[PDB]
Symmetry: D2
Subunit: 336 residues, 4 copies
């Protein structure tokens, strides 16, 4: 009977890897988590015991050469994405890769070429916000012309204070802002021209010498003089604050003005309380499932999803520009 099962091998079983692994194994239609790769033995025992993964590997190339798989999910550290993407494509496997695509512009361009040489194989980057129901609803309003042309986008990505102690990386803007950059490109269809970024380690000055930032902000000018504002942070007291505001000529919208946990309002001595989502797995649970299913369906239906290596390239380049602008404390042109 038509359209069978896509067998997937995963690499990277950190927090996010385990979410994708668990989802593929137990929720995603027409998919099997067949293989897993990790350099941490305990992670491979987990894959076998919890998810019943049949083939475990210590090495990614070993998995892609030998495992009974049609596709891979790449959830390794960012420095490994490009080489693993190329290897999987060269072994005839469809590829889902987490963001960022890579860290080095030249290396990324090498991978773009490899991808272009395997056009029959699916390649999808994990910009999961494109699959989130609220982002999609806003995108629809924008596409329908309901707020007119976009004049400004403000996007915030602030991690919960709960993560600061362990955090004390590639930089604040690469870590926190790449989804925001992609959202800006997605909604506008436009590119970013120049940026200025500033930052502070006011709560945790230890990050000064570690090179890092606890909170940063940026102003960006787009190609048609569209404006964008970013805030990125690692120290939100109220939970996981990911919010995107779009201002248009005819209206305005905000996606998660505040990060409401659910439909429950609590009233007590502190006033009126809306509990908040606390972390990315909670906030983006639906989006992760949707992007995984889209990847599997793309293979079965031979239809591209629309999230390209170019989207990856531009994401990384803008983030590098923000980083450079922060270090120089000056305006930087992205194309340079």
């Amino acid at each position: 009977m038509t359209q069978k099962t896509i067998k997937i091998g995963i690499v990277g079983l950190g927090r996010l890897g385990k979410i994708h692994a668990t989802n593929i194994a137990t929720k995603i239609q027409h998919a099997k988590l067949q293989a897993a790769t990790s350099v941490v033995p305990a992670e491979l025992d987990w894959a076998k015991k919890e998810l019943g993964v049949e083939e475990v590997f210590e090495d990614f190339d070993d998995m892609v050469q030998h495992a009974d798989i049609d596709a891979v999910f790449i959830v390794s550290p960012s420095g490994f994405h490009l080489q693993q993407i190329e290897s999987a494509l060269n072994a005839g496997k469809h590829v889902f890769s987490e963001k960022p695509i890579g860290l080095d512009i030249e290396a990324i361009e090498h991978t773009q070429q490899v991808i272009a040489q395997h056009a029959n194989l699916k390649f999808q980057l994990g910009f999961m916000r494109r699959f989130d129901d609220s982002y999609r609803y806003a995108k629809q309003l924008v596409d329908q012309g309901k707020i007119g042309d976009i004049t400004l986008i403000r996007s915030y990505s602030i991690d919960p204070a709960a993560g600061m102690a362990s955090f004390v990386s590639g930089g604040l803007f690469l870590d926190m802002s790449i989804h925001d950059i992609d959202v800006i490109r997605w909604f506008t269809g436009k590119e970013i021209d120049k940026v200025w970024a500033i930052g502070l380690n006011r709560a945790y000055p230890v990050l000064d010498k570690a090179g890092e930032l606890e909170t940063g902000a940026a102003l960006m000018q787009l190609e048609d003089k569209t404006m964008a504002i970013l805030v990125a942070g690692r120290n939100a007291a109220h939970g996981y604050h990911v919010e995107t505001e779009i201002i248009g000529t005819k209206g305005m919208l905000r996606i998660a003005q505040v990060p409401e946990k659910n439909l429950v309002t609590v009233m007590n001595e502190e006033g009126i309380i809306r509990p908040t989502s606390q972390n990315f797995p909670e906030r983006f649970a639906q989006a992760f499932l949707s992007e995984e299913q889209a990847f599997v369906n793309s293979i079965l239906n031979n239809q591209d999803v629309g999230i390209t290596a170019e989207d990856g390239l531009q994401g990384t380049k803008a983030a590098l520009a923000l980083q450079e602008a922060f270090e120089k404390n000056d305006i930087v042109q992205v194309a340079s």
Copy 2:
């Protein structure tokens, strides 16, 4: 020059009396707080020292007979309203009276007659919600036909838990619900036919034997089979909860769905917080000022405000019906 100063004498310098007194003396245009009556000497010294009241009295009839006043504000305990209303009108004074108009239906009707015999004098009852900006905005929407005919009104009046200790009266529904009854009559233009009320002293069972209630609820059927729901209480943990919901054939609205204090949203470890108004003087500050100014302006302009003794009568009767329904634990017809 046209339209001079209305000199007012006040009786009752409890919490609410002091608010009206302070407002008349310091905020209200074309008004002077000329006289004050109280059986508490400290209250009269307060009136003299804080507000510069020129004439103090221990007795209301003495004030109305002898003070240089055009009008009175009656803010005494409810059992004194009727006799003070009659005395003031018989002495040629315009009358503002706090709710309730009185407690006894027969006695109230006696006062309605006295009022009818002094039609040249203004008489206004302190149903301040009619002057509140939010209530007025909703009233306007209703009057303009924006929600169609009203099918149901739900109104809550819940005092803050901060007041329970002192509270441990005339009954819960007379105390808390008379404004709600008036709001229902005001918005609908309709009368209440029969009611059932229940109640509980779950947080403070001491009120069982004291006759009182800490929380009560009621269902009411209006003359055209319009529905109304009341909740009254003395134990709100989040502040002063006064909320009115109107459901119509074309739409629905809520006045203070939650009692927002101001425009400030706070985000911290507890989630997203909206601080709340804490007590009636805070919530209804604007309404008190507006009704006081309306009273003064009515006298200067010789124009009736529209809040009549009949509005007072029906308020008290419906509240008595709710009380009776609670005590009998059965449906009571208001007209009986």
Copy 3:
């Protein structure tokens, strides 16, 4: 390998039946939609074509006698639930049944006996709100003692005006309020003693003669003098309004104070807009999936879910009491 696949046969392929069918076939782990029963041929072709159901039946007893199934999902009209429950249990099948369990108290008690005689088989009623994330969050707060003892519950179930034209049944309270009754019992652990219900057909008087109601309201007194308020309706202009408020001695909460569609806020000429969920499949999508998975898992793990025939009985009895109270326009004791 441990714990295989639960094969399910479904009866009833109306709107809700098709949701359960689609979910079981495509989303639920360890489940197969093996069989379907319907008296509408087009529905059986749908089951075969859309979901690949292998065995179709025109008759429920034929399905339960002959299909290769372990369990049934009963989503037929309410008058068929009891007989189909008994038949499935007598044929050794685990049973999920939609609410209400049945319509006749005596007939329901007959089925309770049959259920008691098949204790090895799972029986679960579709009170899906118990599986909804927001309801569960509130339940947790209540269970943890965060609002103290419950003094009052107000619950609204109002269907969108979009459905009125087709609607123009068993009565308004049986149709709309049974989930609310169950929620009240679930949160409190208490039973309902007596009720009064009123109603109106103000937008659609045609329902007067049809016996029906477009909007109704009720006050209920529980066994410990806990209070409850219901509103049920078929004419909400803003979408699907299902809201539950719980007032406790230490706090208060509302589940879906307003029925927010998602995390998107829109700002335009009309003010600040939150779009709303429009219908039950949208609002309770997660809850339906969760209750279906719970049913399958209960069978695999041999662990009862906790939603009993008694919960069904009490749901129907309270709804009948509300109906009787409405028709008599008087207080009715549920136990009578």
Copy 4:
């Protein structure tokens, strides 16, 4: 009897001037609107007829030399503020001046000297947001240490689209952002070091050649590397959007996240609607009254309010810096 009446002369009877005039004449305690100056005769007839102003003048120096006044309210166009401030102080009058203090840094410094030479006379600038109840509530939380040290402030001032047609000035940031600059200085106690501003005329390109901007955005770095973000605009579809967000080390708050008009929520076919405040007189009505009363009380009580010429100077300088940064499309240091 102690503390008499402050007689005030006003200049400028545009929209804002008429608000101050009306307030002083009819609401403010211990104040009389004695005199008015305007070069528009109709405005002087208005002052006489509507407010009963006794002395009208065509010339400001004539008013301050000859009118029976103790103080002035300067609500003329911005280019006249400095010369009118100096004249009033030299004639022994207390001075309230609207923002901005002036437009030219050198000229402003000349006026600062004149002010320093009249220390016995009150001087207050109309930064009314400092008197707004919501801003004051947030200020209190910040002062009490509740959000810790401030890491970022984002402030938006967007005028309603209703004003665009007439608007089609001194620049967008001087017009719209001076209150935001002052708010940033007020809350932080810190100064602004360097800025970058960008802008667009996407809805109304006619403003390109007129020199103006319809929407602009800015990033600012403060002296301790505190961050600030501004958005200024003239084309808000939803009303008057003035919002200030403060992010601290321990928490976050927003003042008017959305510009709620009142406590009324409306539910209809468009979803859940909160109507919005439409213009500055509506939004800041309370603040205008409070700052006027503070000015009068400062004179009566001989106590400075705390809003100085320096606050004015820094407001104008930062706005000029934003303007320069926009024109050059580069980072500008405020102190240069």
